[PDB]
């Protein structure tokens, strides 16, 4: 994980590191961020996420 650091702009894109709270994945690429904050993957672990906080209201 300590990747080979040059971050050279003359062809390569920016790459910042991201993360996801309601999946709990990590990412290191543009396009890798992206597509995950838009697959199936995603959208039906959000709705899980969800459904168990919005559910465990169990007591008052
Ligand atoms: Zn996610």
Same mark, same amino acid.
Request: proline letters at 3%.
């Given at each position: 994980? !300590? ?8 062809? *390569? +894109?920016? #790459?910042? #590191? ?7 994945? !990590?990412?290191?690429?543009?396009? +890798?961020? &992206? &597509?995950? %904050? ?6 039906? &672990? *959000? !709705? ?6 919005? %559910?465990?209201?169990?007591? #008052?």
């Amino acid at each position: 994980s !300590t990747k080979v650091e040059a971050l050279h702009q003359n062809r *390569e +894109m920016i #790459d910042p #590191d991201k993360f996801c709270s309601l999946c709990h994945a !990590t990412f290191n690429d543009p396009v +890798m961020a &992206q &597509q995950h %904050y838009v697959g199936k993957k995603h959208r039906k &672990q *959000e !709705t899980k996420l969800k459904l168990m906080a919005r %559910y465990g209201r169990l007591a #008052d």
